[PDB]
Amino acid sequence: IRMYFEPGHYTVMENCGEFEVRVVRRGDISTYASVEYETQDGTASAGTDFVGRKGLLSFPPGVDEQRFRIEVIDDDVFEEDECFYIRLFNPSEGVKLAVPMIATVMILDDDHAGIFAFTDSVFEITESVGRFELKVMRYSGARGTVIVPYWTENDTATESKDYEGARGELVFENNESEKFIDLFIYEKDVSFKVHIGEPRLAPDSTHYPKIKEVEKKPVQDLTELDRILLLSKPRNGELTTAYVRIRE
Amino acid sequence: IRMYFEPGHYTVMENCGEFEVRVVRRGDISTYASVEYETQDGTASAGTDFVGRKGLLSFPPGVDEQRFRIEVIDDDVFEEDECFYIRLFNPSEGVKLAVPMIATVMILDDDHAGIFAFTDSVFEITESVGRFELKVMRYSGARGTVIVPYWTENDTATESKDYEGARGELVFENNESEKFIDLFILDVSFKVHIGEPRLAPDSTHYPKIKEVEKKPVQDLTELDRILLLSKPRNGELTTAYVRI
Ligand SMILES: [Ca+2]
Ligand SMILES: [Ca+2]
Ligand SMILES: [Ca+2]
Ligand SMILES: [Ca+2]
Ligand SMILES: [Ca+2]
Ligand SMILES: [Ca+2]
Ligand SMILES: [Ca+2]
Ligand SMILES: [Ca+2]
């Protein structure tokens, strides 16, 4: 009877090259069917973010579905989440066209810095451990080399009594995305804070020279391309402060 | 026996004004029991985003739970989302504290412009049925007036053959999420697009904007960064597709 698309959308990182897409025939199927497709551009275009492709889908007697990898074009550049479209057409004389014969394909980037934070905003532990590896997690990207100031604080707890006054800076290299602050430390429960400061790209990140040279230009005089470069750079997140509770 | 927050986690629209926080008694409810708490600063602050409260709850023998209100400060300025913190203390001897004895609280800024985008990347439309109400959403915010360019594109469906003209711009006033684009029809398909959202030369923060937009990004302080972000944008879908 008809012949369509299943699944409907495809969400895919820019960094996996080959990726499959799945076509479907329906109703009766005893005969040799067929249909064709074309990779139409969106905010992703053949040549820049995916390599445009056209082809022919043959559904011999018996088979009722077809597959085919499409390719995504990797790069070191920071962009945003774009779409390109694939479109069905020319179904042979038996088979008609049903929903959906146009497929939406999102390309998630990964060349962003980007966002830095803690797991929870309160952590527990006794007081006979006696070091706690607090994790600062890197999300949404790993691109570049980034510093991550950090420091502790007293609350129900005081340095050199409940814990050890700890201060420093975490250095997230390129493709790394989790670092651990090292934290050294009958009833009695107290707690101290611990913050992560303003993430900053480091001089060696292969994009750092470029960035502080644009910040020369007034907001006003920024291209789209230039505008986005500035959207790439790293930042904290919802959890820039944590708490560490110490019972016994 | 023990006391804690429940929920130990709260989310809030900065425009709500207030909301209730909740504590709880576990062991022996047959006795009177007290407890304190005090708001303490996080990403937020007790004069730009809400009000400060250290206070006193009473758990008369019989009640095993308590509730109180915290007030959110509303404003015009777009900020990012900000977890602030409430924490209990000074329990009555009988009782001990427990998790979550630190309620974390987030403030959801309502002051973005905000983010526009079609509802779907493909819309289906039946044979002989006239007009369709296409929607442009405005997620994340709706702070001030935003102008929204649209139009139409010849495809397999041709303008003035399958569909037609349709080209203008939508003016989302202040507190408005959605506005429609209008499409006029008579196997194939055409796509519709939205453009590059722009504020209006009157939206209270606009001189204030193109003023700072004069600065070298460099000398752009910190609140200039955040102010800046608040300007309207497009979400995921900026092309629709109409199937006939
Ligand atoms: Ca692109
Ligand atoms: Ca891309
Ligand atoms: Ca990449
Ligand atoms: Ca990219
Ligand atoms: Ca604030
Ligand atoms: Ca606020
Ligand atoms: Ca507000
Ligand atoms: Ca606000």
Curated annotation (Swiss-Prot), chain A:
Residues the entry annotates as binding Ca(2+) 1: E14, D49, E79, E82
GO biological process, any: neuromuscular process controlling posture
Keywords for the protein's UniProt record, in alphabetical order: Antiport, Calcium, Calcium transport, Calmodulin-binding, Cell membrane, Cell projection, Glycoprotein, Ion transport, Membrane, Metal-binding, Repeat, Signal, Sodium, Sodium transport, Transmembrane, Transmembrane helix, Transport
Entry's Gene Ontology cellular component terms: axon; postsynapse; rhabdomere membrane; sarcolemma
Family: Belongs to the Ca(2+):cation antiporter (CaCA) (TC 2.A.19) family. SLC8 subfamily.
Functional note: Na(+)/Ca(2+) antiporter that couples the energy of a Na(+) electrochemical gradient to the movement of Ca(2+) against an electrochemical gradient across a membrane, which contributes to the regulation of cytoplasmic Ca(2+) levels. Mediates Na(+)/Ca(2+) exchange in photoreceptor cells and involved in controlling Ca(2+) levels during phototransduction, affecting magnitude of the photoresponse, activation kinetics, signal amplification, response termination, and light adaptation.
Protein name: Sodium/calcium exchanger Calx
Outcome of mutating F78A: Perturbation of binding cooperativity of the four Ca(2+) ligands, probably due to disruption of the interaction interface between Calx-beta domain 1 and Calx-beta domain 2
Residues the record lists as binding Ca(2+) 2: E14, D49, E79
Locations listed in the record: Cell membrane; Cell projection, Rhabdomere membrane
Domain text: Contains 2 Calx-beta domains. Calx-beta domain 1 binds two pairs of Ca(2+) ions. Binding of Ca(2+) induces a conformational shift that inhibits the Na(+)/Ca(2+) antiporter activity. Calx-beta domain 2 does not bind Ca(2+). Calx-beta domain 2 contributes to the cooperative binding of Ca(2+) to Calx-beta domain 1.
Positions bound to Ca(2+) 3: E14, D74, D75, D110, D111
GO molecular function, one term: calcium:sodium antiporter activity
Residues annotated as binding Ca(2+) 4: E14, D75, V77, E79, D109, D111
The keyword Lipid metabolism is assigned to this record: no
Tissue specificity field: Ubiquitously expressed with higher expression in head compared to body (at protein level). Enriched in photoreceptor cells of the eye (at protein level). In the adult head, expressed in retina, optic ganglia and all neuronal tissues.
Gene name of the encoded protein: Calx
Domain Calx-beta: 1-110, 114-248
Organism: Drosophila melanogaster
Residue numbers of the full-length protein present here: 442 to 694 of 950
From Swiss-Prot, chain B:
Positions with a binding annotation for Ca(2+) 1: E14, D49, E79, E82
Residues that, per the record, bind Ca(2+) 3: E14, D74, D75, D110, D111
Record's subcellular location: Cell membrane; Cell projection, Rhabdomere membrane
Effect of F78A: Perturbation of binding cooperativity of the four Ca(2+) ligands, probably due to disruption of the interaction interface between Calx-beta domain 1 and Calx-beta domain 2
Protein residues bound to Ca(2+) 2: E14, D49, E79
Coiled coil start-end: none
Outcome of swapping H112P: No effect on Ca(2+) binding kinetics
Highest taxon, organism lineage: Eukaryota
Residues bound to Ca(2+) 4: E14, D75, V77, E79, D109, D111
Calx-beta domain location: 1-110, 114-244
Tissue specificity: Ubiquitously expressed with higher expression in head compared to body (at protein level). Enriched in photoreceptor cells of the eye (at protein level). In the adult head, expressed in retina, optic ganglia and all neuronal tissues.
Family of this protein: Belongs to the Ca(2+):cation antiporter (CaCA) (TC 2.A.19) family. SLC8 subfamily.
UniProt comment concerning the protein's domains: Contains 2 Calx-beta domains. Calx-beta domain 1 binds two pairs of Ca(2+) ions. Binding of Ca(2+) induces a conformational shift that inhibits the Na(+)/Ca(2+) antiporter activity. Calx-beta domain 2 does not bind Ca(2+). Calx-beta domain 2 contributes to the cooperative binding of Ca(2+) to Calx-beta domain 1.
Job of this protein: Na(+)/Ca(2+) antiporter that couples the energy of a Na(+) electrochemical gradient to the movement of Ca(2+) against an electrochemical gradient across a membrane, which contributes to the regulation of cytoplasmic Ca(2+) levels. Mediates Na(+)/Ca(2+) exchange in photoreceptor cells and involved in controlling Ca(2+) levels during phototransduction, affecting magnitude of the photoresponse, activation kinetics, signal amplification, response termination, and light adaptation.
Protein name: Sodium/calcium exchanger Calx
Originating species: Drosophila melanogaster
